Amino acid sequence: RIELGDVTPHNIKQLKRLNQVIFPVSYNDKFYKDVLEVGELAKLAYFNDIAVGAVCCRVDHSQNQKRLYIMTLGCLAPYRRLGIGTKMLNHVLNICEKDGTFDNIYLHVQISNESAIDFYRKFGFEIIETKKNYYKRIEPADAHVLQKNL
């Protein structure tokens, strides 16, 4: 019942709508312009042909490493615990497995996001750091950095 699809100018508004509802932090027009330029690093998740989730990633060059950073990976609350998040994460893991040049995958979550910690830790991710005041106008502002070594 869950299918992933490409992010295009035809459905980019549906992606902005999902991110607005799922994530307390707002993203600028440049974030969404860049999402159309990353290819397989951005997908929509459909539950019975309804768009209910999305994943947006970018390549990062930090720590003298080639890393895949997950900017947003989310699902609408009533559709949670159905495997949508797993479908999106396995897609990113598969891309990295086939690419073979990424050293690690990493992301940021609020320290209060127990469901996100639980989800990522099931895939081999570890909390490698806790960054104080990472988020600016929301509480908690502190964020864990979750990373999976490849």
Partner: peptide, 4 residues
């Protein structure tokens, strides 16, 4: 969740 990226913090922009």
């Amino acid at each position: 969740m990226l913090g922009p």
